[PDB]
Amino acid sequence: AQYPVVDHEFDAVVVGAGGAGLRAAFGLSEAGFNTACVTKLFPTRSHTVAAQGGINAALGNMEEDNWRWHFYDTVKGSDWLGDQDAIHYMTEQAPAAVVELENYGMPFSRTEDGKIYQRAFGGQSLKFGKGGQAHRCCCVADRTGHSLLHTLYGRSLRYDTSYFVEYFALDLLMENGECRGVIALCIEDGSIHRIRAKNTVVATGGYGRTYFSCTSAHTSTGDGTAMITRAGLPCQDLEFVQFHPTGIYGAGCLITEGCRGEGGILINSQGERFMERYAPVAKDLASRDVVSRSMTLEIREGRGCGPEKDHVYLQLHHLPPEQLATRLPGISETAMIFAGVDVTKEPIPVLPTVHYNMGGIPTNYKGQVLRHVNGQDQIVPGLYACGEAACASVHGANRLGANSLLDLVVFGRACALSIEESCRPGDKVPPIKPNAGEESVMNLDKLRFADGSIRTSELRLSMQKSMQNHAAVFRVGSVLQEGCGKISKLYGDLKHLKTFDRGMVWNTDLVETLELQNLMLCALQTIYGAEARKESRGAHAREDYKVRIDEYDYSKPIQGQQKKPFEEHWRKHTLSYVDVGTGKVTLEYRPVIDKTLNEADCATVPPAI
Amino acid sequence: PDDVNPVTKEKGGPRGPEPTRYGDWERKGRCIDF
Amino acid sequence: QKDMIEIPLPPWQERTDESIETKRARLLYESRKRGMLENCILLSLFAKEHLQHMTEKQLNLYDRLINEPSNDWDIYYWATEAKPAPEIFENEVMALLRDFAKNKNKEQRLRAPDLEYLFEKPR
Ligand SMILES: Cc1cc2nc3c(=O)[nH]c(=O)nc-3n(C[C@H](O)[C@H](O)[C@H](O)COP(=O)(O)OP(=O)(O)OC[C@H]3O[C@@H](n4cnc5c(N)ncnc54)[C@H](O)[C@@H]3O)c2cc1C
Ligand SMILES: [Cl-]
Ligand SMILES: [K+]
C-alpha cells in the first residue's frame, strides 16, 4: 500500500518506557532537552512493573556497610566477565540513586527509626566476603517496580517529555556511522514516524520470549537488540541467560524454592525422586543450574512428564496441607489459576525457565553504545543503551538478585548525564536522507501481506521449543550444534511466513510477526555464541567444557605462570553479528574491563576460583 | 499498626510472611527474584 | 501508595471515536501486551473468549477495567480474589473476569492463544 510518513525532530529520543527508559527520559527532560519517549506499551505496562522485589544500595541502615563491598559481591557474581568500571560506577551511585528515588516520591519502606529498611538478598556480604550477610535490598511495599514506573513517568510529564505511546520502533536511523533517530510504527493507525534526534537511547528490555519458558511479559521480544543487529552493530554476551529450575510449564511463572525447602520433591515420569541421583546430599535443594541440568537429562532420556514428555513434576501433595497453607500461603491458588492443579493431590508441571538476559547491546559505563573496530572499542556517535537491553556489563556471567532494578536507574541516568555533558538542548539535529527508513517500511509491507506456508504461530513455537531444547541450561557441543542448525533453518523460514490481518489499525498479527523477526535474530546470536564458547562461566556451563578458562589458572599462585594470549582463553566478551539477508552469524571478542574508575577509590578484584 | 509489621516494625513494607524467608523473594508461592 | 496520590497520571477516558471493530482490535493488543506474564495469559485468554462477541457497552467496561488502573497487579489481585475492586469496577465484566480466574473446571491456562481464532475456522 501507501504508507503515510510523518517526520519529527527532537534533541533526544528514548526507545523504551520501563525503568531504564523512563529514568533516561526524565533525566534528559529535567536537564532541558526536548525529549521523545517511544514505547510500544503504556509505560506502567512495561515488564519493570513485574518486579515486586527490591533494589540494592549500600545505605548501611541496618549495619555498617560500604558500597565497595557491594562492588565486590557484584564482581564475584559476574564470574569476572563483569566490567569493573561499570560495576564501580553502579555500586558507588546506588546509595544516592535510591535516596533520590525516595525524594522523587517512591515510598520506600522504613525502619522504626525512619531509615529505608533493608533486607539481606542475593548472597551479598560485608567486608569483601569475610563479614557475614549484608542488608542492602530496599523496596516499596510489594510494588517497587510499579512505584518506579509511576514516579518516573509522572515526573517526566512535569518536564514536558513527549510520549509516543503504542508506537513500535522498527529500526535506527543510521547514517555514516552515527545514529540520527528511530523510525517507528503507530500501532493505532498504521502511520510511519521518523523521529530524528541528535541522541538516541535504546532501553527496550530483554528477549526472554525466544524460549518456551520465561518469566517475561509477552512484550519481551528483543526489539532494540534486533535494531542494533540490523544496523550491523554487535550484540554482546547473548549466550549468558539466567534460568530458574522450577517455572510452571508453558506459563513460566516461577515457583519458589521454598516449596522444596518445605519438603517438595521433583519427580519424573517413573515416579522417581531423581535429584537423589544427581545431588545425593542437597537433593532438590541443589543449586539452580544443577537442578535445571538434572531435569533436562531426565527429559532427554525419555523420563519427562505430560503428553509431550517435556517437563517434570514438582510434588507437594505428600506434605500436610496445613504446612502448605501456613508456610507457603498462596501456592495452592497460584497453581490452580494457571496449571489447574490442586497441590494437595496433583503435582505442578515445571521446567527450567529464563529469568534474565545478562547480554545485550554493549555499552561503556556512560551508556554509550560500542562498536568493535580494528580490535578497539569505539563509541557509536548519538547512540546509547541502558537497562536489561544493554550490556554495560555490570552482571557479566550472572546477575545478582536486586541488582537489575538498580542498573535501570543508574544507567538510565548515566545516559542522560552523558548527553548533558556532551551536547546542549537545541543543538542542530543532523538531517536524514529523504528515503531514510525505506527498508523498514518495505519489510513491514512484506509482513503485512505475507501469504506463505508457515504461520507466525508455528514458526514462533518451533523457535521457542528449539531454544528450550538446545540453548537452555544443559549445553554440550553436539546438542548446541544441532540447535544452531535448527535456528538457522527457522531463520530461513521467515521468508515463508503467513499472516492474516491486511489492515493497519491495531494490527496485532503484524506487530507479533515483527516481534518474531526480532526474536529470531536474538536466538541466532544466543545459540551460536553458546556453541562457540568452550568453557563454563556463570550461567553458561558446558558438559564438555566444565572449567572456567581464564588468562591464568587462578586456582594456583600466579607467580611463574605464562599468561594465555587473548585468543587462547575465554575471559572475554562475545560479540555477535548477523548478516540479516543471509542469516550468517559472525563472532568476535573484546576484553573484559578489569580497571575500575579509580584504583585508589575501588581496587580491581582479580579473578578467583 | 495498619502498615507497621508487628514483628520488625518495618513501615510500608511487604505484606504477609517475610518474602525473603527462603532466600529468594516470594509472593503467593511465586518466585519474584533470586 | 503515597506516590500515586501525590503524582496523579493523566486520567483514563472512555473513547467515542472508535468503531466497534477498532475498539475490539485495540483491546486485543492491550489485553495481550501487559507488564507481567500473569495478566498477559489471563487477559489474552479472556479477550479471546469475549472481545469479538461483546457489546459496545461491555467493551467500554472492559476498557476501563484493564486500562484505567496504573498497576497490573491491582487487576490481577482483584481477579484472583486477593483484593476487592473499587465500586467503579463492580459490574458484569468484572464478575465475568473474577469467575474466569477461579478456573472452576481446572483447565490449563499456560499460554496466550495463537491468533488464528480470529481468522480461520477450526477444522
Ligand atoms: C517477573 C520479574 C520480576 C522481577 N523482579 C525483580 C526484582 O524484584 N528486582 C530486580 O532488581 N529485578 C527484578 N527483575 C528484573 C528487572 O525487573 C528487569 O530486568 C527490568 O525491570 C527491565 O527493565 P527495562 O527498563 O530494561 O525494560 P522493560 O521494563 O522491559 O521495559 C522495556 C520498554 O521497552 C519498550 N519497547 C520494547 N520494544 C519496543 C519497540 N519495538 N518499540 C518501542 N518500545 C519498545 C517497552 O514498551 C517497554 O516500555 C524482574 C524481572 C521479571 C521478569
Ligand atoms: Cl549433593
Ligand atoms: K542485558
Residue numbers in the entry:
A (entry chain A): 53 to 661
B (entry chain C): 75 to 108
C (entry chain B): 44 to 166
Copy text verbatim from the article accompanying this structure deposition.
Respiratory complex II (CII; succinate dehydrogenase, SDH) connects the Krebs cycle with oxidative phosphorylation, making it a master regulator of cell metabolism. Although data are limited, the synthesis of a number of findings suggests that CII activity is regulated at the level of assembly in some biological situations. This may be a relatively complex process as mature CII contains four protein subunits (SDHA, SDHB, SDHC, and SDHD) and houses five permanently-associated cofactors (covalent FAD, [2Fe-2S], [4Fe-4S], and [3Fe-4S] clusters, and integral-membrane b heme). In eukaryotes, CII biogenesis involves at least four SDH assembly factors (SDHAFs). SDHA maturation requires FAD, dicarboxylate, SDHAF2, and SDHAF4.
As a result, mixing SDHA-AF2 with SDHAF4 at 4 °C slows SDHAF2 displacement and results in the capture of an SDHA-AF2-AF4 intermediate. We purified the metastable species that formed from a mixture of SDHA-AF2 and SDHAF4 at 4 °C, crystallized the species, and determined the structure by X-ray crystallography. This identified an SDHA-AF2-AF4 assembly intermediate. Here, SDHAF2 and SDHAF4 bind adjacent to each other on the surface of SDHA. Despite adjacent binding, each of these assembly factors interacts with SDHA, but not with each other. As relates to the control of maturation, the most striking aspect of the SDHA-AF2-AF4 structure is the decrease in the intrinsic disorder of both assembly factors. In the SDHA-AF2-AF4 structure, both the N- and C-termini of SDHAF2 strongly interact with SDHA, but the additional ordering does not involve a significant increase in secondary structure. However, when in complex with SDHA, the C-terminal 34 residues of SDHAF4 are associated with clear electron density. The ordered region of the protein, comprising SDHAF475-108, has little secondary structure and contains only two short β-strands. Extensive interactions between SDHAF4 and SDHA involve strongly conserved residues from both proteins and hinge upon intimate contacts between the two C-terminal residues of SDHAF4 (SDHAF4D107 and SDHAF4F108) and the active site SDHAH407 and SDHAR451 of SDHA.
